[PDB]
Amino acid sequence: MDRKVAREFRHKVDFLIENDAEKDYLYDVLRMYHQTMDVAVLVGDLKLVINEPSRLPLFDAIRPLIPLKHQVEYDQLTPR
Amino acid sequence: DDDRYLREAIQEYDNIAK
């Protein structure tokens, strides 16, 4: 049952970025949060890529897959 | 819904190799 989330997640991010280099790095950001498991790291990179409000959805976009506990803490770290 | 969707999308890209 867990598969479309990837398409909707990748399709959404692509709808916002529409770029490749950006998605590559953003894809790298997620890969990092997976290995290092450091929410503080995701926020940093996500910013460098989401420096503009236009890429705001990335926060709410990634949250879903982001651990329920980390989701809240993710909110505590983010001002929005 | 935790520690499952991440690998789904993460690995999905790992397969795409884009």
Residue pair A31/A42 in contact by the 8 Å Cβ criterion: no
For A1-80, the fitting CATH number among 2.60.40.420, 1.10.1040.10, 1.20.1160.20, 3.40.50.300 is 1.20.1160.20
| From A10, A30, A68, residue closest to B2, measured CB to CB | A68
Q: How far is A30 from chain B (nearest CA, A)?
A: 7
What is the DSSP track for A22-38? HHHHHHHHHHHHHHT--
Taken in order A51, A36, A66, A75, the sign of the CA dihedral is negative
Q: Is A70 helix (H, G, I), strand (E, B) or coil?
A: helix
Q: How far is A13 from chain B (nearest CA, A)?
A: 11
Give the tokens for residue A40: 């503080």
Give the tokens for residue A43: 């926020």
Beta carbons within 10 angstroms of residue B6's beta carbon = 20
Residue pair A9/A64 in contact by the 8 Å Cβ criterion: yes
Q: What angle do CA A26, A72, A46 make, to 5 degrees?
A: 15
Q: How far from the centroid of its chain's Cα atoms is residue A9's Cα?
A: 9
Which residues neighbour A9 within 8 Å (Cβ) at sequence distance 6 or greater? A61, A62, A64, A65, B5, B9
Give the tokens for residue B1: 């819904």
